[model samples]
Target: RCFCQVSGYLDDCTCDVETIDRFNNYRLFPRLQKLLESDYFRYYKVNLKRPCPFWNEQAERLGAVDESLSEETQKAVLQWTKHDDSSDNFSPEAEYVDLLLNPERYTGYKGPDAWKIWNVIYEENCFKPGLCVEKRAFYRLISGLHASINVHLSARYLLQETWLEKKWGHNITEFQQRFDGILTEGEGPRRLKNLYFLYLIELRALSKVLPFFERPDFQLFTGNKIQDEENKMLLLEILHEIKSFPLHFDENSFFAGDKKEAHKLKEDFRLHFRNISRIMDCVGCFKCRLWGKLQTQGLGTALKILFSEKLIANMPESGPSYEFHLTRQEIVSLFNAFGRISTSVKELENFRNLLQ
Candidate 1:
């Protein structure tokens, strides 16, 4: 009874817990899972070796005063580059990794280092706890992310290792440890609620961007043209199906105040989120960093879609519109990120059964 119950509405979002669970489990997860496996969405391009910006022993040990910007300025938002076409400057030699090959299962990336990354995020980056009440959603978003990752780790845990074979499957004990709020620190139910919150935000973003995907000019291009078209149809169908969910997180709620106040808040939110995306580079585990980067970029792209009123305002119903563009990487990440949350929700159902 305790494990299955999470009542009331989400912290900042409109939808309630039970509504999101049913929507995701029945309508959203299965279709989104299929959409991600298609040729275009499976591959992700990233540079795994970007050095951690906060501190590095090499510079300090060598006694060379490296030119390091203050962390705030380093993580500060540059221009509002929505459609990142200038790939030449970003990463000339970025390599592609098949997301299917590297599942978000357990890696040995635990201990103080893992703990420190999250601590830095909550303490240093999330605006001094809850003082900024308006930014509560941001905190919940981060918490939701943490919960999802923990859910993955718990769900597909390692059980046996031998020379012949290694087995990985559910570990109920791990689930209890990670989620049981009383036995552990963060309440299990609360974290689950945050995961639902993350899903709502991402789902709403997907709904808003269907227009971008619906444009015939846009292609989810792999080398094969026919497969690309077929996959696009599948993608559109799944998206259209998911769009039927009545309750969704309202984006307008965040910056609903005076224009100046709204502008400042939006900028702050964007800057902080971009910094969090960059922080993924600091993760020591390569596999962990890969998913982390993808999920953040996915969420970042969603934020771009939600907040890009200036760009979206100029876009007409059907015609060549120069106002909006999305990089292939963004599209891939967005789908995969939602897929991740969907999987987490599905996994939670399994755990509920296990607990029963």
Candidate 2:
């Protein structure tokens, strides 16, 4: 049906497939794969304890266990509301989870609820019902993120999980269903294109924010001074290499219009994206939620850097003059998000070769 071929320039991005694939395979992918394995990028912090705001806004208020309430009142509250297992809550505070230990492989996290979360994203949260330029960008961004996630699931799919041995390998059938347009019909190519779109966006963010990371005082801290220095240098080297790519996504293409309209548009865009980030907390699977949260926050951080004209203006100069700042978590999510996209790009080749 002419859907398997994901070629040409990505929608709204400068670089074409051939250029990006070559750049990714030879330099960017390899460097980022290694970079993300480093200590500073390995642990991600997130609070995965959010109740689904869409469904349980009032239920949440009713479910809270107040010490001041009488025993009978507490009993009534408990009986009236359904309780999720305590394991489902990842604590009220943000907790650190090692990416390596809890990899984003297939976890059978599919079916009605998973599809429901995604539908909510595309239908309600991503675009606000019109064909505005920024709305299309928002749709493509979320679509790309979803495509990368499916790539992860299919690439490292669970073949068998017996008592003794657990097997993981590429599930060709799953891959075909997801991206060859069999299951979804005409969605395969579009979703794959979005994956590349996400790559370029994050790539642009990394390139734009390089000067900040390259600051003399900057360190990718994990407390082992020497290794942290090494990691920081590696990040600089990789970003410097990324900066050398001839064509990168243009941040200025967004929000370019009448002065008053641009201001309102950017705010509207930011609020919608933040709401999507909040939706990540409601994801049913813990591993899925983890990656979802990280990638969305990573993209959010990219948006923050891209939209901040003052930050970009002062980026070239030096430290402290610009008000912009990136939390350690943001930095971790930023690199790891791009790393996922890089892996997605590389795995596309694997899938292509297998299908061929």
Candidate 3:
């Protein structure tokens, strides 16, 4: 026999019962009804000893026990926290699909493998290969280096056209003269190359920080310790590659001397990369902790923030616009929509018990 006190039916005693009943009855709320009837909800309710509440005493006990656990156990516990009893923590199926598409986020995995798997699944389901092709094409558009370049250019243009115009008067003729003179005085291609290199540096930083939105799932699947090391190694490799890129391209001839200036440039690039990497890492860690549940949205938001609006408007009419302009506000809105879609997909997963 149960030891806990009860005055009514088990379902009736819980506050969720009424909500569940309403959901079951509402014809328009088909998704909500199905979710409530799902095995996930059934199991979750059965396991809970009492109604959901903020546990003051339970919290203290948990905290004490958590502190006492071994490091590995504690990490495992933390990773499992992604599935804590909160519906808001769920990610939509779309989120997972998006992650699978982004090479930077899910690096070390072969794209060809994903393509093969997708192809098999699509064919097995009797779906057109065109669907897979479309998704692959969209992923390529969104995640490619070329897309980053387009976004960066749009952002730079927006800053120059709008923000700079507001700061400086419409006498752009004088500004152009000054700017052209500076350009003439400076090493044009060298300076341009340096600018591009810095942009790449920023992209790497953004990649390290933004990809962490999906860390909870990553940590849950891969052990926390292993995931941390893997992420660190990947980031270090990326930084090394970024630092070396400019050096390899800086020479007109393939056999240029390793000059002091070249060495200095390399050092400068490394220092900047390290500094930005640290900042980005901290940012990534913070976002990971706070937005683990909203990862799809978080990623969408980041993409929106990083991308320009004009670019978005110009997204190719036929495909996911890889090269386009976007405004800051527009990007934020795009991410918000992405978050909604993510939430829906997560609910679907729960309904299907896929997460379990």
Candidate 4:
């Protein structure tokens, strides 16, 4: 029982059709609009735009019947076959350099193609044994740096807190005395001395290996038995340096306390965090820098979630009398916190970009 005004014909409702169409579009409804605005909705849209359809019988048959060629092979074939009027030859190295200096110019090369060439060259020429060696070295460097920072920070905090709480009759003087005594004694400052020693040993070992890494002649000297021997020596030195930390830590009393189990747990937690942190740092530096607006935050977030979950999962179920040590609600809260943290981490696309 709605009335409509027609100018020419009853079927022709030409009352600014574009605007009218926009207004009447069911797709643009408020609920739909709000849903579309959400991150989940955006993710959904992205998924939809690039849908991964499982091959049906017909599609599989068609694919099998068609030419079996990789994308790279096809691209190479096409470029080779195509008739080009230009006299210039395609220089991959020049293109790679251009891509390195001005990546914005090469917008088409997404994902790994964007920086993989440069990464390969850099790894092979500048840091021998390629990505694996570079990654290991970088991880070690970062882990050491993080450990050093943690040690210094923890020491400072302990010192400050002890000084502050001394007036309140919380006898922390013994702990402080023990800490200082480490330096004066043969051991030196418990964590600091051990960490510094490890750092120096690693640095010296890495320096010795650097010649082989940086030198193209040494790197490509596979057939040369003498060069191979030198390379093996360098690798052995590197391994020795890498092994020093665990060896030192094993022998050292970094966590000397009454609560031995708790001290061990803390040390384990710190080590795990340090390892993950180093990995995340390296990935963030290399991947995030190349891939614009990637989700680098996820790695740290995921590690944190995993750490929290482990902590909660390790909690004692009940007291000696079978009474609840922690309430069921608290346990559930811990699980929920873990889930939230995990979801937050997974949403970070930067980590995914790095993997790609």
TM-score of each: 0.81, 0.81, 0.19, 0.18
How many clashing pairs per prediction, in order? 0, 0, 15, 4
Q: Per-model C-alpha lDDT, please?
A: 0.70, 0.71, 0.27, 0.27
Please give the distance, in angstroms, between residue 197's alpha carbon in candidate 4 and its true position after superposition.
7.1
Cα-lDDT of candidate 2: 0.71
The TM-score ranking, best first, is 1, 2, 3, 4
Task: Give a tens-digit lDDT track for model 3, residues 1-356.
Answer: 00111111120111232232232234213443232222221111001012212111322221121112346544543443454433223221111111111111111122453344233322322112224212221222123222222222222221223533522112233223322336447533223222232332233223333333222322222244565455444433433433332222222311122455334433333343233222222221221211222222233333333333233334454432334322322222233223222232222223234213
Lowest-sum lDDT 10-residue window in model 2: 1-10
Cα deviation of 11 in candidate 2 (Å)? 5.3
Ten contiguous residues with the weakest lDDT in model 3? 40-49
Model 2 spans with C-alpha error above 4 angstroms: 1-11, 56-92, 124-134, 181-185, 248-252, 255-259
Give the poorly placed runs of model 4, Cα more than 4 Å off: 1-198, 201-227, 236-252, 255-271, 274-356
The candidate maximizing lDDT is 2
Is candidate 1 or 4 superior in lDDT?
A: 1
Error of 4 at 307 (Å): 20
TM-score of model 4 (CA atoms): 0.18
Span of ten consecutive residues with least summed lDDT in model 4: 43-52
Query: Please, what are the lDDT tens digits per residue for candidate 4 over residues 1-356?
Result: 11121111121111232332232232223332332222211110000011112211321221121123445544533342242212111222101011112111111222454244334323321122213223232233233332333322222222222433521111233323433454347332433333333233222222222322232322212223465455445444433433232221121221223355434433443444334333333322221222211111222222223223233344343322121122211222222222222221221222223324
Q: Model 1: per-residue lDDT, tens digit, 279-346?
A: 77788777788888888888777767766655665677667566677777788888898899899999
